[PDB]
Amino acid sequence: PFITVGQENSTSIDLYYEDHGTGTPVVLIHGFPLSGHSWERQSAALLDAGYRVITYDRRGFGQSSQPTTGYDYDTFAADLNTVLETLDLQDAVLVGFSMGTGEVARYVSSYGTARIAAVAFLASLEPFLLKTDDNPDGAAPQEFFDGIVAAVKADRYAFYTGFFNDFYNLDENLGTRISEEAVRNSWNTAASGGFFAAAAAPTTWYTDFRADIPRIDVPALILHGTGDRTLPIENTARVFHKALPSAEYVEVEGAPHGLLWTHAEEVNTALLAFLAKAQEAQKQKLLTEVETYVLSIIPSGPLKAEIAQRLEDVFAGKNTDLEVLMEWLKTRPILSPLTKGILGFVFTLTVPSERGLQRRRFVQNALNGNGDPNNMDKAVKLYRKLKREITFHGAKEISLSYSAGALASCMGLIYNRMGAVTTEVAFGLVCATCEQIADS
């Protein structure tokens, strides 16, 4: 897949991207001289964990175009911006590794956090690697960077191997943390990046990111390997945390620069922990909106009290015996059969485990649109549109344009697995139904 970010000469600039999974969007920004593919260990864990995963290759790397222009953090941040806006990502998590942490700071700083839920910095450049009279801490003098440039220009090919020696602590980590062949692929990935980008990248490393830091307004994670040869933990990791006290700080004991590949297990653990805090927070707000809509159709009373606890407890994660819950609903005197079907649907959808329970006749009968062909016809039409929706509100908005009979029939269609939509879109459907019924 490609996203066009600009034009050079007669040929556009295209950034290779792959997007995976469903759920809260997590964008991974790779390090030098690798590509989106370097995050495979991170990607597999995020997919299992239930998160949308977006990866892209920075201009000059992996499968993106190889212009001879735009090697700067402003351009790189603008490249990121185009990706975000192209995909209309909201409530996204931005995770940068090495060079990628420069993108995360600069984007947040310049563009703001409206689409952004949280950020994570792994093996960070921050704050400022250039060692200057104004700031003593920065790791190396300018002469040192000038050094690398010269080395890459002399030989990209030997140079990648040299970076690998530094990058992975191969004397320490070979044959242990990772196989050599896996390492060999990384050289192949680097050899595959543009010749111009290879020599121009090292000049972006000593960008001063100190100004950007005060901007971050969203929860952050800082993660560094204490055995980091490439980016000394003290110069950046020690310093950055002091600049952003609030963000949780994790140190990976004796991890080299290449923690994710060498130390993917430690990285995933640390990252998923930090992400879980931001994920569960908006997960609850998803549950809460659903609950008000669901409660709106129930008559006020003690039963409405019992139901609310069930909505809240399963929502909070207490795995309940759906079989027990369903029998209770089924036998409740107060509820209308329609109401019981809606609740029946909600519970099976939200309960942690269905425990292989067969669908319930009381629900199938309640959500069948009176077996009316016109209701069913419209329900099938709605379903088609819902398959294209990805948010709760978009789903709820389109659903409200349908009659209650058609909405109930659509719910039965999903309930019975004759069709499938994402969870949040299903919530929007049942909420539009509740809204229509309550309004009656």
Which residues belong to the active site? 98, 228, 257
Residue 437 in contact with residue 340, Cβ under 8 Å?
no
CA distances from 195 to 79, 117, 184, 317, 366 (A): 20, 36, 19, 52, 65
CB of 110 to a second copy, least distance (A): 8
* Minimum gap (Å) between residue 312 Cβ and a second copy: 23
Report how far apart, in Å, the C-alpha atoms of 56 and of each of 4, 76, 115, 130, 414 are. 12, 12, 18, 28, 34
CA 208 and chain centroid, separation: 27
Tell me how far, at minimum, the Cβ of 136 lies from a second copy, in Å.
Answer: 12
Question: 157 or 277, CB closer to a second copy?
Answer: 157
| Distance set, CA 365 to CA 9, 107, 310, 416 (Å) | 64, 52, 23, 11
DSSP 113: S
Q: Give least dist CB 111 to a second copy, A.
A: 9
Q: Is the Cβ of residue 292 or residue 416 nearer to a second copy in the bound state?
A: 416
**Nearest distance, CB of residue 14 and a second copy, angstroms:** 8
- Rank residues 360 and 396 by Cβ distance to a second copy and give the closer one: 360
Name the amino acid, one letter, at 434. Answer: C
Task: Give me the residues paired with residue 97 across strands.
Answer: 122
Between 144 and 164, CB nearer to a second copy:
164
And the tokens for 256? Answer: 């080299």
Rounded Cα distance, 345 and 288, in Å: 17
Shortest gap between Cβ of 133 and a second copy (angstroms)?
Answer: 11
DSSP-assigned letter for residue 99: T
Residues present in the chain in total = 440
For 184, how many CA atoms within 13 A lie in the half-sphere containing its CB? 4
Amino acid at 425: V
d(CA 399, CA 386): 8
List the structure tokens of 63. 């499968």
Instruction: Choose between 315 and 348: whose C-beta lies nearer to a second copy.
Output: 348
- Measured from the CB atom, is 212 or 228 closer to a second copy? 212
Nearest-approach distance from CB 113 to a second copy, in angstroms: 10
Backbone angles phi, psi at 122, to 5 degrees: -115, 130
Helices (H), 192-301: 195-204, 239-243, 259-262, 264-295
Task: Specify the residue, 86 or 292, whose C-beta has the smaller distance to a second copy.
Answer: 86
Give, as one character, the DSSP assignment of residue 13.
E
Q: Which regions of 174-241 does DSSP assign to beta strands (E)?
A: 220-225
Query: Which ranges in 351-403 belong to alpha helices (H)?
Result: 361-366, 373-387, 392-399
